[PDB]
């Protein structure tokens, strides 16, 4: 309903009001979101004269509403979900062995653009510390955001480690903890467990001499697989000997889809074994197993199994399983070993 | 950089094709639009001839790469879009295992403000039997990854993949490509350096078209060149109280304008900072865990990282990586110290 509005490229303007350690400022930012390519691009300004802190301090305060949710987790996007009236946005975000932020956000659409107003309170820092003794690399890491479902609050909480760079080698953590609530009384989705992959990078204006931040930003969803493979089994053997690989299958049933197995050995192309039609009254196997392996699969249980007798050294790889519901999807494999 | 910009927007595409397969004549006539920004690709495709001789899976790969999605640091290595708007010849042989030969030359130019793929197929030595003419190919298609080298004598590249058909008894028919693309125009173009393209596609079909038809969605992303990429060396199995020297090969930066620093993940724990060093080198930093038994260093010149691992204990197994930030975070593929007995 209100992903319609990020469809487009979206103007956006950042407003904060800062105070750390009595130390106070203000930064102002404008810019444009494209959630179409989960892209931001924006120019933050202190109007206050000189920044009391690091610019990358203020990174995550200063609208993952603009994150690229791809097709399939589109469900599970509380963010556009709750616009335009918006959400409310708290995080508390401590640096360790140094002080920490509070913070409290409002992201709503105004007219055409999307306002992000923050009030925020840093408190117990250090002044020789790395945040306020400005030891911190002018830069941004790439850093995965945890996100879980709040019922009891309708919204969202969020869980994430950002690192910071420090100039002598070393790195300042801030752990941040993060609770979303709608600003309406419109229904929201509320997701399942899932992280968005947010990579950012810093630089400045060349023309401007004022205190301020240029920063360009990629966040995009992830964490949810509509299929999955569990390969199990593999083991090292005797020649001669037998064994079986069970897979497990999620996110279709196995007996409306024909199933393969591959496996690849160390140096060689990742070759085609065995398989089994959709309905199950044909199975195929190539050539160099022919007779000694058996593939088989149980509706019930869902799993899918491929049985190895008479193995020879040159069956020795690992055996992946193999399904294609409008997509291919592959295990993470299984390794089996025949020596001597 | 010309040629870029013609892809900038989502632009319409019109195929055509031509083909004999063993003396069995049809043509495929298809319409949709790609975008490039996102590689993907949406058409519908239609047999005028009446029904397809062929399964329609095997005329995927044969029926617009320009419109793969290069990333900014792959931009140079582009040759698809380079070409454009005069555009290039796309030659394959296709060898279905067992089984007959494709042979196809295309032309794909920009018409107006449609992007055209014109294309003639020949088939020959085909089992009328076989998994082809007799269309024992399931209604699907694979993941393949598309590789991608230079030929410096066209003008142009080189391509060799193996597509994988499902066959409906539970088997796959093997199509092996060999691919060779060339400008149509003498103006100077992109070439690559070796790189892949990582591409998805999904069948479906139209409810109200009674034709023969298909319904075909693809994603189509290069990849395998970074623009910047440390590689860890070194580790080994070591015992308690042992020492061993970790190296990492830099490429895409100097080692001495940047600060460079080593992770390191226990099984099953979160991975940790351990060592690093500024960026002028005059100021390096460990952990309290590794304090005074590891020290980290570099060599300006071979541009390479080091970290000297002394009085091991078995708590320092783990995989290493190594890290810098150019404009974004990069990590190595890491490599595995163990410390145990023997």
């Known amino acids: 309903k209100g992903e319609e509005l990020f469809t487009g490229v979206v103007p956006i303007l950042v407003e904060l009001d800062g105070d750390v350690n009595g130390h106070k400022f203000s930064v102002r930012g404008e810019g444009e979101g494209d959630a179409t390519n989960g892209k931001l691009t924006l120019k933050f300004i202190c109007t206050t004269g000189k920044l009391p802190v690091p610019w990358p301090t203020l990174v995550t305060t200063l609208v993952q509403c603009f994150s690229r949710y791809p097709d399939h987790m589109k469900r599970h996007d509380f963010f556009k979900s709750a616009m335009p009236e918006g959400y409310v946005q708290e995080r508390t975000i401590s640096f360790k062995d140094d002080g920490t932020y509070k913070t409290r956000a409002e992201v709503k659409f105004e007219g055409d653009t999307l306002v992000n107003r923050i009030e925020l309170k840093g408190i117990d820092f250090k002044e020789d510390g790395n945040i306020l003794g400005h030891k911190l690399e002018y830069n941004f890491n790439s850093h995965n955001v945890y996100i879980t479902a709040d019922k009891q609050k309708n919204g969202i909480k969020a869980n994430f480690k950002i690192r910071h760079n420090v100039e002598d080698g070393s790195v300042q953590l801030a752990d941040h903890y993060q609770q979303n609530t709608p600003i309406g009384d419109g229904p929201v989705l509320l997701p399942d467990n899932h992280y968005l992959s947010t990579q950012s990078v810093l630089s400045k204006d060349p023309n401007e001499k004022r205190d301020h931040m240029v920063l360009l930003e990629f966040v995009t969803a992830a964490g949810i697989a509509q299929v999955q493979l569990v390969e199990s089994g593999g083991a090292l053997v005797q020649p001669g000997g037998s064994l079986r690989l069970s897979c497990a299958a999620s996110g279709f049933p196995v007996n409306r889809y024909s199933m393969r197995w591959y496996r690849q050995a160390p140096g060689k192309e990742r070759e085609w074994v065995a398989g089994?039609?959709?309905?199950?009254?044909?199975?195929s196997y190539e050539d160099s197993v022919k007779g000694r392996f058996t593939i088989s699969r149980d509706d019930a249980r869902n799993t899918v199994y491929l049985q190895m007798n008479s193995l020879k050294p040159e069956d020795t790889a690992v055996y992946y399983c193999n399904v294609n519901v409008g997509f291919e999807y592959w295990g993470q494999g299984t390794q089996v070993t025949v020596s001597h | 950089s010309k040629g870029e910009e013609l892809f900038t927007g989502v632009v319409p595409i019109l195929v055509e094709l031509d083909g004999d397969v063993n003396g069995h004549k049809f043509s495929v006539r298809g319409e949709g639009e790609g975008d490039a920004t996102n590689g993907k690709l949406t058409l519908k495709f239609i047999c005028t001839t009446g029904k397809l001789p062929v399964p329609w899976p095997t005329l995927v790969t044969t029926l617009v790469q320009c419109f793969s999605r290069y990333p900014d640091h792959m931009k140079r290595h582009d040759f698809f879009k380079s070409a454009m708007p005069e555009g290039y010849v796309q030659e394959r042989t296709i060898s279905f295992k067992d089984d007959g030969t494709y042979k196809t030359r295309a032309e794909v130019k920009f018409e107006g403000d449609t992007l055209v793929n014109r294309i003639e197929l020949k088939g020959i030595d085909f089992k009328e039997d076989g998994n082809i003419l007799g269309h024992k190919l399931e209604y699907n298609f694979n993941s393949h990854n598309v590789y991608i080298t230079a030929d410096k004598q066209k003008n142009g590249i080189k391509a060799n993949f193996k597509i994988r058909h499902n066959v409906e008894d539970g088997s796959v028919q093997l199509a092996d490509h060999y691919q060779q693309n060339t400008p149509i125009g003498d103006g100077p173009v992109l070439l690559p350096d070796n790189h892949y393209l990582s591409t998805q596609s999904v069948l479906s079909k139209d409810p109200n078209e009674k034709r023969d038809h298909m319904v075909l969605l693809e994603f189509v992303t290069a990849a395998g060149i970074a623009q910047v990429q440390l590689v860890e060396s070194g580790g080994a199995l070591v015992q308690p109280g042992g020492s061993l020297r970790l190296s990492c090969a830099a490429s895409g930066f100097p080692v001495n304008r940047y600060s460079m620093r080593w992770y390191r993940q226990a099984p099953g724990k979160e991975r940790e900072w351990?060592?690093?060093?500024?960026?002028?080198?005059?100021?390096?930093?460990?952990?309290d865990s590794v304090k005074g038994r590891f020290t980290i260093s570099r060599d300006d010149a071979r541009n390479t990282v080091y970290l000297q691992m002394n009085s091991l204990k078995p708590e320092d197994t783990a995989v290493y990586y190594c890290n810098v930030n150019v404009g974004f975070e990069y990590w190595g593929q890491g490599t595995q110290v163990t410390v145990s007995h023997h």
């Open positions: 089994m039609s959709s309905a199950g009254d044909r199975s």
